Amino acid sequence: GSSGSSGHYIFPHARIKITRDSKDHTVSGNGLGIRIVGGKEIPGHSGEIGAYIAKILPGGSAEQTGKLMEGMQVLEWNGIPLTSKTYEEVQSIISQQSGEAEICVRLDLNMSGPSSG
C-alpha cells in the first residue's frame, strides 16, 4: 500500500514487468536474468545513492522486453525502493521473488559503469 489513483512520476520512467520462464537452459534457480547494484551514487542527483542495472544476460528475461537496458537507474523494484540503500539490501530486495517481477527504472538516465564481466 502506497499509491492509489494513478501512480506516475514527475520524471520520464519506464515501468515494465518481467515474466518468469519455466525451464529453458538451467538447473539451479535464478531470479530472472536481471542484475542491479545498489549503494551507487547517481549521476546528477545531489550526492545521492541508488540502484542500477549492473548488466543484462545474453537474451534473458530482462533483455527479452527490450526496453530494460544496462546502465539504467532503477527507481524502484517490485514497488520496494532501492534508493538510499546498500548493494546487499537492494540485492536481497531483488533476489527474492519466485516468478515474474516488476521493475521501475528511469527513462532519461545513463550510468555506464566499468563492468567487465
Cell 549521476 -> residue = 43
Q: Which residues of 18-42 are buried (b: 16+ CB within 10 A; e: fewer)?
A: beeeeeeeeeeeebbbbbbbbbbeb
Q: Looking at residue 43, which CATH number applies to its domain?
A: 2.30.42.10
Q: What total of structural domains would you count in the chain?
A: 1
Secondary structure (H, E, C), 52-114: EEEEECCCCHHHHHCCCCCCCEEEEECCEECCCCCHHHHHHHHCCCCCCEEEEEECCCCCCCC
Which three-class secondary structure state does DSSP give residue 47? Answer: coil
Q: Are 68 and 56 in contact (CB under 8 A)?
A: yes
**Structural domain span for residue 104:** 1-117
